[PDB]
Amino acid sequence: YTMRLGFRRYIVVAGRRNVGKSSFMNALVGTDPVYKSMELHPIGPVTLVDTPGLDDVGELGRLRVEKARRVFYRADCGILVTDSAPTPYEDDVVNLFKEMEIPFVVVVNKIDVLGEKAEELKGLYESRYEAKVLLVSALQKKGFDDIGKTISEILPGDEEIPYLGDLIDGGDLVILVVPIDLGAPKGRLIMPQVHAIREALDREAIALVVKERELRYVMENIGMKPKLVITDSQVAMKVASDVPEDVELTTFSIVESRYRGDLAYFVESVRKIEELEDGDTVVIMEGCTHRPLTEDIGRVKIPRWLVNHTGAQLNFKVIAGKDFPDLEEIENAKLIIHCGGCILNRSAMMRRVRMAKRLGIPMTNYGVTISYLHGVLERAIRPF
Amino acid sequence: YTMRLGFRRYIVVAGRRNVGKSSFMNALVGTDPVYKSMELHPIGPVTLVDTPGLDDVGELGRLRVEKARRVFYRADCGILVTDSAPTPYEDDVVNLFKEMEIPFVVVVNKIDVLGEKAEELKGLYESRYEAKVLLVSALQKKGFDDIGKTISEILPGDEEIPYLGDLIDGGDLVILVVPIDLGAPKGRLIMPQVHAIREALDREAIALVVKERELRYVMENIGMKPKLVITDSQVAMKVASDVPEDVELTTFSIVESRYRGDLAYFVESVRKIEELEDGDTVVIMEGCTHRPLTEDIGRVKIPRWLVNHTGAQLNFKVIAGKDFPDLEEIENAKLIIHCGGCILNRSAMMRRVRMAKRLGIPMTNYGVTISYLHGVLERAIRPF
Amino acid sequence: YTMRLGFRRYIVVAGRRNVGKSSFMNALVGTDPVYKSMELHPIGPVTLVDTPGLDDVGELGRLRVEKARRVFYRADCGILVTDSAPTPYEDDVVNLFKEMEIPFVVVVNKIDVLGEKAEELKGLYESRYEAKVLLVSALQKKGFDDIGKTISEILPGDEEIPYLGDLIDGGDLVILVVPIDLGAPKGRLIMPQVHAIREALDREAIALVVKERELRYVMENIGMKPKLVITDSQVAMKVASDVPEDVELTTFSIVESRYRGDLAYFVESVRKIEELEDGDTVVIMEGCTHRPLTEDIGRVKIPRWLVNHTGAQLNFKVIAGKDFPDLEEIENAKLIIHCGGCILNRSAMMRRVRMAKRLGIPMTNYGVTISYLHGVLERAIRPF
Amino acid sequence: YTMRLGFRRYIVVAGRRNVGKSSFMNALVGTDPVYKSMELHPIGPVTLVDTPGLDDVGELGRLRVEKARRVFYRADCGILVTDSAPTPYEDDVVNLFKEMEIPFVVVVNKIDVLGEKAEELKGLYESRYEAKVLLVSALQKKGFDDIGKTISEILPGDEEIPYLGDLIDGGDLVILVVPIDLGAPKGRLIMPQVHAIREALDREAIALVVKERELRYVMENIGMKPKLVITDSQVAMKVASDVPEDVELTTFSIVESRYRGDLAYFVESVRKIEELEDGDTVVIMEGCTHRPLTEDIGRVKIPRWLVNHTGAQLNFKVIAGKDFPDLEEIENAKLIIHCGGCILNRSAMMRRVRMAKRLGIPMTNYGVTISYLHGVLERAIRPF
């Protein structure tokens, strides 16, 4: 509809079953598949979809990978509903889930006139993940009840990586913070800058803020030798100048913000520009934004410096929107450059970072990208 | 950056001048053109751009229309800065502005060592629009001062068309309002429905709300014969059934909301589906939205019913984003289908409706479109 | 500090202990008592206070009621930390809690070198409330862990009483809704009115909205005989006129809103005006509001009609503020008239309704009050 | 009703007239007086009230000051509507307005069958304020039209005093900022602190933030000798310690925030504690707040340190609420202590500061007060 820029989770219930699987669907509730949505805690509002045409097996009863993967890349975790005991299919999915770094759990349909219980098997057969959950169409107690629990435990969780690891408190440790011209609005500072300061202090250090011109001064006078400097833009150069200490580990704001929404992959994938060939396609996922009629970074600068920095014949595809894009649109793209400011919730960035990995498409973002296209090297500061 | 979905106005300062025109730029302030932005009242924050490469004249000193139009279609109004007296160029632009239903005003550069004043000319020569404004680089009083005034008066204004014209108050006049299943959220009603009711009452009438099933009942019993019924979706059919009076002028909610953001053009342009040819391209401007993984109206239903209703070989181009799209992307498109819910400010819809007209591309929207693809006829109710 | 008008819960940990009770305090964490606050789920942010001077026992080891009650009236539930086995004190509190309709739970300090477990006792001795919770300063697993759980279960919960019980859906059932002049703002309706409509519809009925003047008309014509009418203000009179059916159960909006934040007590307490004596004091708790410099209902009208309706010599005490007032300020007040619009969360109104009961001070509110001072009788509609 | 904590302006139309004055009322529109409200620009929504019982003159035709003042203290400016030429009454009011530092304008009722125009008189007679405005009940052009203009010009305006005057940019100038323990919330800083930093930078200086413990360090090492230090709470003491330079002008955050909502009066009035006598009454205007059940500054600490610091027998009167309090409630009060955090809009604080002056009641606030009760002396820094 529209909102203030909900990150709703996605879940896949897989299986060859249906009359002993769909009962699980519609029930256990608070161009072919069924995407029904509801809500559960302790986690939130969510969506449950079922193996669409993934129901058609092979003569050997095998999954149909390529067809699956293509479905399973969105998932935040999956659910397996089996009718019988383990078969090849049951293993095939689990191998993907596993394959695709994606959490999941298994279910059943406990009929009570025989007195069975197979899950002992899956307790260890197809992995463990202690994925073991008795159930039934006889919507019994363990239905849309105790499931949400563990499953919650299943999902991601608390990444929350320190805005810094090399803080160094105690007898202090200065942290220069050199900003631009202003930043707007009146009597305000951009979040990154504020977030920083708050950190230096949470790490009982001392934060010093200072404009460009005054770098000369400050640095020289101040007896205290810093332990961390931080900037943004080509402003990093003039600083590289009166460095004034290379012993000193410096960095961008842009980059520290980047560090909070998986950094590795971005460096890994950004370096990957050098092997770009004429005619290849790059995806500039610019999300929802107010675009300047001036040199828009995402649709102008970047594309440009990109050709320049490499060999032309490059094909760009800008994509706007709150949600990630449909695979159809990005499949067969060498690199994806995603805006940073767009997403702010680290957890919702991972969703997208993972998705990209699962499709094996290297993704990076404006920050890293531009830093790279200049010298994204000095911000070592994380090598662990 | 990001916001809660600012509608900033756009203005073009045109002229062959520059050293006697750009002084007007940067000054008079509170891949080549200069887009500088500021703010002025009584209207708001705005942008001033200058004739980029439109500076290069012909050997006869003519404008260069096609090149201009391509620029001038965004404008909310234009500003003309002339160095000399009227020439062909001065007329050429004015003919466009005029041509393109776009407001504007004229300026100068009053040097005071001669004692001139030409504007008397333009008082009537190139149109009137009483566009007459002395000025100078000697940034004198009448600079970024008394301009904003009139100019404000120049721009659009108060469309604010009655949510209804056939109200009919006095001895009352019922207005059935037949809704769907629910609408969410708890104890709430969608705005349209509320907006309606408030109107019936502002027009001292009586609003009756009632679900589907109960149409049979209500209609029959109620002595009172209505004067207006209102629905949404295929629900309009079941109503067409126990109409129960065709004398009775009925309509969609979707449609009344449409009526508030220029209706004509939409009907005019929507009817235009019949002359669509194989291979032609349609633009589904879906703005910023949360897309269902189910049949998304804009990217699925509509496209589909569209092929169906006509001859295939159709090419679609969905476009998302807060802003209208760049001409490059839509130029050479037979029709544009724009989401309704997206924009809510009638004044900001007109901006876009005009833009489309100026490019001569027929535009319509989901509402009208779907109504049409069913029977958008009965809602006569406006023929004036 | 300030906010948009957090309803934080209050809890009392009681006991004669302290070195075997306070360890429970500060620890088990995520002009004399200690009010430390933290947060716990599944419920929210909360406060834990301890028996201040309630630590001083009698020579017989009795509680000190009057002194307690005075403390215990705020509580949303209480916590009992005992050192020894049941004694008189342990019973005394429980009798209050019980006495004062307030939930609670019991704790301990399990030393493991003997091998005890007394709670079996309190399992049934001092009530049940299955209040049984092993613990220790050896902050063991069952500390600030499994407590929040049950305790949550302890607290209030889901009152959520139907905006109506006599709905009557099926073959429909009209519900007139007669409003005032307007209500503001443009194209909007006050919540109550919207909430109503949504209900009629959730109860598959038919809602008819209609202004005053048009009552004559509608009623007569309309074949359908209503089942519920609803108004506000002296407007109820003109309706009482062309009633037009007394068989017909009518009511105020003001009153239905009242029904959602305990109605009984309000009627019970409002009737209590007749036994008011000269010199008695009434509390007009007007919460945080924008006061008209015109006849403010709370500080003018009500007080006035109040004297009028009874014998003067009345003493008023208006009290503003987000929170309920300190007992010191209201103790020894015959009646409390609380604004309705102020609180909106039924659950936070109960907090206050209970508090008043616990102090045995009759409380009512503007709605009921004014309805009464006119004829709050006809809205029978709830007698169960 | 309720809102997120509108500052609506107040205006008094004065005069002995009424049939030639009230026509001005109700008309010229977009326990006895009439308070009608509307809206006008360029300023906002506002209220117009008329001389209630101030209509009854003396046998000599004099105003009735004491009775007036009592009315005129709320006003943001006044309007004078005269029937005849200047008389004593016309002078009397103007003397108050003038007396009471309050803006105003004069009007008429131009009958056109004689051909008059007296305003020439009032052009200079009763002051000037170029208060000269022809009008009439014949609601002519100059009615609710050109009035709002000038009148707007009449009212307050742009105080906006620099968060600092001794900035000292150029070759820099450090500004230590020593904070508490934290401040909450995560990765955030209280506004004052941020506002400060932004200033140092807007004044091309250098802001250094640093906790307590680290004062020792920083100060000593850092070659740079500061030019401004800033703190809050008793934390100012430990700083007074390693001052470490008294040459150095230091201060509270609390105080700089105070500086932005008239400081003088607060110092002037706060010093006035020494002449407090037993039995006198102090007003603690605490506005709308979330009160801690712990030592609430406004209702506990302050009152307490207040008695202590002086002679008991003191009477306190705490007053909560969005609006200033009615004179009846505060008249005959020696001092008023107003919360700072409450109001944030300097312009709306002045409204209240003026009001207090007009009643000649000394007002101060928590900040100043507590600073004083310790040592509010060192923050000289403003002596101009």
CB D209 within 8 A of CB D187: no
What would the DSSP string read from start to end of A226-286?
A: -S---B-TTHHHHHHHT---SSS---BHHHHHHHSS-SHHHHHHHHTTTT--TT-EEEEE-
Contact partners, residue D21, CB within 8 Å, separation at least 6: D13, D15, D50, D81, D83, D109
Residue C86 CA to residue C119 CA, distance in Å, equals: 10
- Rounded-to-integer distance, Cα C304 and Cα C302, Å: 5
DSSP track, C37-75: EEEETTTEEEEEEE-SGGG---TT----HHHHHHHHTS-
For residues C86 and C122, the answer to whether their CB atoms sit within 8 Å is: yes
Largest CA distance in chain C: 86
How far apart CA D282 and CA A305 sit, in angstroms, is 69
| C364: nearest Cα among C265, C287, C280, C286 | C265
DSSP state of D255: H
In this structure, the dihedral spanned by the alpha carbons of residues B281, B285, B286 and B287, taken in order and rounded to 10 degrees, is: 150
- Alpha helices (H) in B118-184, listed in sequence order: 120-124, 147-154
Amino acid at B176: L
Interface residues on C facing D, Cβ-Cβ cutoff 8 A: 1-6, 35, 47, 49, 288-294, 319-323, 341-342
Place of tokens 């105690």: A170
Cβ-defined contacts of C91-96 (< 8 Å, 24+): C91/C126, C92/C62, C92/C63, C92/C65, C92/C68, C93/C14, C93/C63, C93/C68, C94/C126, C94/C127, C96/C63, C96/C65, C96/C68, C96/C69, C96/C72
The Cα–Cα gap between A336 and A363 comes to 4
Q: Please say whether the beta carbons of A263 and A161 come within 8 A.
A: no
Burial class (CB in 10 A: 0-12, 13-18, 19+), A1: exposed
- State yes or no: cis peptide before C103, omega within 30 of 0: no
Instruction: Identify the three-state secondary structure at position B317.
Output: strand
Q: Which of C47, C322, C341 sits opposite D1 (nearest CB)?
A: C341
Burial class (CB in 10 A: 0-12, 13-18, 19+), C56: exposed
The full length of chain B comes to 384
Instruction: Give the Å distances, CA to CA, from B201 to A244, C191, C212.
Output: 73, 16, 11
Query: Could you write out the DSSP letters of every residue in D270-297?
Result: HHTTTT--TT-EEEEE--S----SS--I
Peptide bond preceding B325 in cis form (omega within 30 of 0): no
Q: Which two tokens mark A136?
A: 């039934």
Cβ-based contacts of D293 with chain C (< 8 Å):
35, 47, 49
DSSP at D114: T
Which alpha helices (DSSP H) does chain C contain, by range? 65-72, 88-99, 120-124, 147-154, 191-202, 215-221, 235-241, 253-259, 264-271, 302-309, 327-330, 346-358, 366-372
The answer to whether C323 contacts D290, with C-beta atoms less than 8 Å apart, is yes
A76: Cα within 13 Å, side-chain hemisphere? 25
Query: Which residue, A57, A56, A71, is CA-closest to A11?
Result: A71
The two three-digit tokens of residue B335, written as one number: 């029709």
Kindly report the number of other CB atoms within 10 A of residue C86's CB atom.
14
Contacts of D11 (CB under 8 A, 6+ apart): D46, D47, D48, D49, D75, D76, D77, D78, D79
The closest alpha carbon to A288, from B288, B5, B326, belongs to: B288
Paired tokens of A85:
């005991």
Residues on chain A touching B5 (C-beta within 8 angstroms): 2-5, 288
Query: Of B319, B4, B322, whose CA–CA distance to A296 is shortest?
Result: B322
* b/e burial code for range C6-36 (CB count within 10 A of at least 16 → b): eeebbbbbbbbbeebbbbbbeebeeeeeeee
- Give the residue ranges of DSSP H helices in chain B: 65-72, 88-99, 120-124, 147-154, 191-202, 215-221, 235-241, 253-259, 264-271, 302-309, 327-330, 346-358, 366-372
* Long-range pairs for B229-236: beta carbons < 8 A, 24 or more residues apart: B229/B175, B229/B176, B229/B177, B229/B178, B230/B175, B230/B176, B230/B177, B230/B178, B230/B196, B230/B256, B231/B178, B231/B179, B232/B179, B232/B180, B233/B180, B234/B374, B235/B178, B235/B180, B236/B374, B236/B375
**Whether the Cβ atoms of residue A292 and residue A259 lie closer than 8 Å to each other:** no
CA pair distance A150, B302, nearest whole angstrom: 41
Reduce the DSSP state of residue D316 to 3 states and report it.
strand
Q: How many CB atoms lie within 10 A of CB B36?
A: 12
Which residue carries 């604004």 as its tokens? C339
Q: Please choose, from the candidates C351, C291, C257, the residue with its C-alpha nearest in 3D space to the C-alpha of residue C47.
A: C351
Q: What spatial distance separates the first Cα and last Cα of chain C, rounded to whole Å?
A: 44
Contact residues of D toward A, CB < 8 A: 163, 171-172, 179, 182, 186-189, 194-195, 197-202, 204, 206-211, 213-214, 217-218, 221-224
CB atoms within 10 A of CB D277: 10
What whole-number distance in Å separates Cα of residue C11 and Cα of residue C39?
Answer: 12
Side-chain-side CA neighbours of A150 within 13 Å: the count stands at 17
Inter-residue contact D369 to D363 (CB < 8 Å): no
Closest C-alpha to C282, from C338, C348, C327: C338
- Chain B residues lying within 8 Å of A47, measured CB to CB: 293
Say whether the peptide bond before residue A185 is cis (omega within 30 degrees of 0): yes
**Beta strands in D58-132, from DSSP E residues, in sequence order:** 77-81, 104-107
- Asked whether the beta carbons of residue D210 and residue A211 sit closer than 8 angstroms, the reply is no
Whether the upstream peptide bond of residue D42 has omega within 30° of 0, thus cis, is: yes
Sequence-ordered alpha helix ranges (H) in chain A: 65-72, 88-99, 120-124, 147-154, 191-202, 215-221, 235-241, 253-259, 264-271, 302-309, 327-330, 346-358, 366-372
- Scanning the structure block, which residue is given the tokens 């109860």? C203
Which residues lie below 8 Å from residue C216, measured CB to CB, with a gap of 6+?
Answer: C242
- C245: number of Cβ within 10 Å: 12
* Six-digit token string for A256: 């520290």
As a whole number of angstroms, the distance between CA C356 and CA C330 comes to 10
Scored b (16 or more CB within 10 A) or e, C338-369 reads bbbebbeeeeebbbbbbbbbbbebbbbbbbbb
Distance in angstroms (rounded) separating the CA atoms of residues A100 and A77: 10
Smallest Cα distance from A279 to chain B, Å: 20
- DSSP three-state, residue C252: strand
* Other beta carbons within 10 Å of A56: 10
Give, in order, the Cα–Cα distances in Å from D335 to each of B161, C35, D277, D363.
56, 31, 12, 6
Give the β-pairing of D206-210 and A206-210. antiparallel
DSSP code, position D166: -
Distance of CA C101 to CAs C8, C78, C231, Å?
19, 11, 35
Helix (H) or strand (E) run with residue D120 in it: helix D120-124
- CA-angle at A116, arms to A110 and A122, nearest 5°: 80
Which residues in chain D have Cβ-Cβ distances shorter than 8 Å to C293?
A: 35, 47, 49
What gap in Å lies between CA C54 and CA C34, rounded to an integer? 12
- Closest of D210, D190, D191, D195 to residue D164, by C-alpha: D195
Owner of token pair 């049934």: C124
Secondary element (H or E) of residue C374: none
Task: Indicate the DSSP class of residue D298.
Answer: I
Contact C381, C166 (CB under 8 A): yes
Q: Judge whether B52 and B15 are in contact, CB under 8 Å.
A: no
* Contact check, Cβ <8 Å, D214/A206: yes
CA torsion angle for C178, C181, C185, C190 (degrees, to 10)?
Answer: -30
Query: CA-CA distance, D382 to A41, in Å (whole number)?
Result: 57
What distance in Å separates residue D340's CA from the closest CA in chain A?
A: 19
Dmax (CA) of chain D? 86
Q: How far apart are the first and last CA of chain A?
A: 44
Give the DSSP H or E segment for D328: helix D327-330
CA distance C323 to C12: 18
Which run of H or of E encompasses D151?
Answer: helix D147-154
Integer CA distances (angstroms), D43 to A35, B203, B226, C293, D39, in order: 53, 32, 46, 21, 9
Contact C2 D342 (CB under 8 A): yes
The one-character DSSP state at C198 is H
* Number of residues that make up chain C: 384
- How far is residue B238's CA from residue B222's CA, in Å, rounded to a whole number? 19
Nearest to C345 by CA among C322, C369, C319, C368: C322
Q: What angle do CA C252, C253, C259 make, to 5 degrees?
A: 90
Query: CB-based contacts of C113: which residues, under 8 Å, 6+ apart?
Result: none
CA atoms within 13 A on the CB side of A249: 14
**What does each C-alpha distance from C147 to A123, C30, C42, C135, D46 come to in angstroms?**
31, 12, 10, 10, 54
CA C25 to chain centre: 28
Residues of C in contact with B213 (CB under 8 A): 204
D230 contacts D256 by C-beta, under 8 angstroms: yes
Please tell me the distance from the alpha carbon of residue C202 to that of residue C223, in angstroms, as a whole number.
23
Q: Which residues of D211-234 are buried (b: 16+ CB within 10 A; e: fewer)?
A: beebbeebbeebebebbbbbbbee
Tokens (6 digits) for C350: 């109960």
Q: Which amino acid is at A143?
A: G
Domains in chain A (CATH in brackets) are 1-164 (3.40.50.300), 165-273 (3.40.50.11420), 274-384 (3.40.50.11410)
CA distance C178 to C176: 6
Pairing of strands A44-50, A35-40: antiparallel
Phi and psi (nearest 5°) for A18? Answer: 175, -50
Is the Cβ pair C290, D320 closer than 8 Å?
no
CA distances to B167, B379, C225 from C247, rounded to whole Å, are: 34, 41, 10
Contact C302, C356 (CB under 8 A): no
With contact defined as beta carbons under 8 Å apart, do B131 and B122 qualify?
A: yes
Interfacial residues of B (vs C; Cβ cutoff 8 Å): 163, 171-172, 179, 182, 186-189, 194-195, 197-202, 204, 206-211, 213-214, 217-218, 221-224
B224/C206 touch (CB, cutoff 8 Å), yes or no: no
Q: How far apart are CA D274 and CA D295, in angstroms?
A: 24
Residues of A whose CB is below 8 A from B35: 292-294
Phi first, then psi, for residue A123 (nearest 5°) are -60, -35
Alpha-carbon span D240 to D231, nearest angstrom: 10
Paired strand residues for A14: A80
Handedness of CA C192, C197, C199, C205 (dihedral sign): positive
D126: Cα separation from own chain's centroid? 27
A–B interface: beta-carbon pairs under 8 A = 67
Contacts of C321 in chain D (CB under 8 A): 288-289, 291, 320-321
Resolution (A): 3.0
Chain-centroid distance, C-alpha D120: 35
Strands C281-285 and B315-319: unpaired
Q: Give the H or E element holding residue D71.
A: helix D65-72
User: Which chains touch D (3+ CB pairs under 8 A)?
Assistant: A, C
A324 Cβ contact list (under 8 Å, min separation 6):
A285, A351, A352, A355
